C-alpha cells in the first residue's frame, strides 16, 4: 500500500505514487520528474489524471505512450487550481522538467514537496519566500556530512578544458560521454560547443532529447554518428572493452578515445579537488570519472532547510530502514537547535 510520505494530507492527492495500483481516495496523481523510480508503474494502461510539467508531459506522451486525455501539464511559477486546491510548480534544479510542488491547503497549512532537487540560494528568492511553509517533504539522498561535491560549473569548466586540449593535440580523437536516463545534459552539450560539433547518439536517445524544450536543439544533436566528434553511449559501455569495440565500429575515422563517466558521489570526494583529477588509461583510451551531481550536497540541503524553517520534515529518500531514519532525525534536530526554530 501507498506510503504516508507520498500522500498530501487534507486533499486526495498523491506524489510519485504509481506502483501501488489504484490508490483509494486519490483524485489526482502528481509526477515530479521523468526518472523510472518515480514514474514506476505508469504505462499506456493508466486511466487517471496525472499532473506534471510540460517537459514531463512530452515524455509521458512520447516515451511511455500514456494517452493524451490523462496528461495535465502545468506552467512553472504560476498559481493554478487543481480539484479546488491552489498549487504552484517550481524549478527543482534536478533533470529537465523536474519540479518542486507547493500546496496551499484549505485550512491554511502550506506544504512544500521538493521531489528530487539540488538546493540552491536562488530558491530563497522564489515564491517560497512570500509565506510560511509548515511541512516539507525532503529529498534526503545526501543527508550526511561526508557528502561534499564541487559546483556544476567547476566540473563543466574542467570537462571543457580537458576535451579541448585532447582534441587539439590529436584531431583524430573521439570524445564519448556515458548516460542512462535524462539529466546531466550540460556535460555533453558544453564539450560539443567548445569542439564546434553536434552530439551523435542512438535513435531512442535522440527521441528522448527532442522532448526537452532545449532551445536550438536541432543545431546541437544528430543521429548521424559519422558526422560528429562527441558521441553518447549507455553508461554500461564506458570501459576499455566497450570503448575499443565502439572505436572499431567508427571505421578508422578516429584512433583514440577520451571518455567521461558522470557519476554521483563515490569515496574519493573526501580528499581530491576537481583540479587534481587524473584519468584511468589503457593504451589509446582514457576514462575520466567526474562528480556532476543533480542532488543537494549536505551543506546545500542544510542551508535550504535552515532558511525555510519548517515545523515538520518528512524524508522521501533512504526511509526503508530504522537506522537511516534515526540518523536523519538527529541531523534535523541539530539544524533546528542551531538556527532557533
Residue (38 or 198) nearer to Ni ion, CB:
38
Site string for Ni ion, 107-146 (x = CB under 5 A): ---------x------------------------------
Length of the chain: 341
Instruction: Examine residue 185 and tell whether it contacts Ni ion (CB under 5 A).
Output: no
Residue (35 or 118) nearer to Ni ion, CB:
35
C-alpha closest to that of 31 among 205, 22, 41: 41
Give me the least distance between CB of 94 and Ni ion, in Å please. Answer: 6
Give me the least distance between CB of 41 and Ni ion, in Å please. Answer: 16
Contacts of 234 (CB under 8 A, 6+ apart): 178, 179, 180
Measured CA to CA, the distance from residue 263 to residue 88 in angstroms comes to: 31
Q: Are strands 110-113 and 99-104 parallel, antiparallel or unpaired?
A: antiparallel
Give me the least distance between CB of 237 and Ni ion, in Å please. Answer: 22
Can you tell me whether residue 288 is helix, strand or coil? strand
Give me the least distance between CB of 146 and Ni ion, in Å please. Answer: 21
CB 63 within 8 A of CB 209: no
**Residue ranges in 56-75 that form contacts with Ni ion under rule CB under 5 A:** none
Question: DSSP assignment of 3-52, as one string?
Answer: -GGGEETTTTEEES--SSSSPTT--EEE-----HHHHTT-STT--S-EEE
Residue (136 or 167) nearer to Ni ion, CB:
136
Size of the site for Ni ion (CB under 5 A): 2
Give me the least distance between CB of 173 and Ni ion, in Å please. Answer: 32
CA-to-CA separations, 63 to 71, 85, 199, 224, 244, in angstroms, rounded: 13, 30, 21, 21, 31
Residue (116 or 185) nearer to Ni ion, CB:
116
Give me the least distance between CB of 181 and Ni ion, in Å please. Answer: 8
Residue (99 or 110) nearer to Ni ion, CB:
99
Residue (197 or 293) nearer to Ni ion, CB:
293
Measured CA to CA, the distance from residue 48 to residue 71 in angstroms comes to: 9
Site string for Ni ion, 16-45 (x = CB under 5 A): -------------------x----------
Residue (116 or 300) nearer to Ni ion, CB:
116
CA-to-CA separations, 160 to 166, 191, 246, in angstroms, rounded: 10, 5, 23
Give me the least distance between CB of 178 and Ni ion, in Å please. Answer: 17
Q: Are strands 135-138 and 71-74 parallel, antiparallel or unpaired?
A: unpaired
State the residues that interact with Ni ion by CB under 5 A.
35, 116
Amino acid at each position: 500500500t501507498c506510503p504516508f510520505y507520498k500522500k498530501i494530507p487534507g486533499t486526495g492527492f498523491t506524489v510519485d505514487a504509481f506502483q501501488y495500483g489504484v490508490v483509494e481516495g486519490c483524485t489526482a496523481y502528481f509526477l515530479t520528474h521523468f526518472h523510472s523510480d518515480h514514474y514506476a508503474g505508469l504505462s499506456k494502461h493508466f486511466t487517471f489524471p496525472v499532473y506534471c510539467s510540460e517537459i514531463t508531459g512530452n515524455l509521458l506522451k512520447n516515451k511511455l505512450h500514456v494517452q493524451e486525455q490523462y496528461i495535465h501539464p502545468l506552467p512553472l511559477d504560476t498559481e493554478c487550481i487543481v480539484n479546488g486546491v491552489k498549487v504552484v510548480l517550481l524549478d527543482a534544479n534536478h533533470c529537465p522538467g523536474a519540479v518542486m510542488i507547493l500546496f496551499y491547503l484549505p485550512n491554511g497549512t502550506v506544504i512544500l514537496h521538493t521531489g528530487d532537487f539540488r538546493a540552491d540560494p536562488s530558491m530563497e528568492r522564489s515564491l517560497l519566500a512570500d509565506q510560511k511553509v509548515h511541512m516539507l517533504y525532503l529529498d534526503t539522498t545526501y543527508c550526511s556530512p561526508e557528502y561534499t561535491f564541487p559546483s556544476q560549473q567547476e566540473v563543466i569548466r574542467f570537462a571543457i578544458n580537458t576535451a579541448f586540449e585532447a582534441v587539439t593535440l590529436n584531431p583524430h580523437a573521439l570524445v564519448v560521454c556515458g548516460t542512462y536516463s535524462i539529466g546531466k545534459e550540460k556535460v555533453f552539450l558544453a564539450i560539443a560547443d567548445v569542439l564546434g560539433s553536434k552530439v551523435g547518439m542512438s535513435q531512442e536517445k535522440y527521441k528522448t532529447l527532442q522532448c526537452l524544450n532545449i532551445p536550438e536543439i536541432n543545431s546541437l544533436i544528430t543521429t548521424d554518428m559519422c558526422s560528429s566528434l562527441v558521441h553518447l553511449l549507455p553508461m554500461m559501455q564506458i570501459n576499455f572493452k566497450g570503448l575499443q569495440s565502439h572505436l572499431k565500429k567508427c571505421g578508422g575515422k578516429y584512433n583514440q578515445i577520451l571518455a567521461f563517466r558522470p557519476t554521483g558521489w563515490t569515496h574519493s570526494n573526501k580528499f581530491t579537488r576537481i583540479a587534481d583529477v587524473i584519468p584511468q588509461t589503457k593504451g589509446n583510451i582514457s576514462i575520466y570519472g567526474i562528480p556532476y551531481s543533480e542532488h543537494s550536497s549536505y551543506l546545500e540541503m542544510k542551508r535550504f532547510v535552515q532558511w525555510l524553517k519548517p515545523q515538520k520534515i518528512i524524508p522521501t529518500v533512504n526511509v526503508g530502514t530504522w537506522k537511516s531514519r534515526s540518523t536523519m532525525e538527529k541531523y534535523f534536530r541539530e539544524w533546528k537547535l542551531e538556527a532557533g526554530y
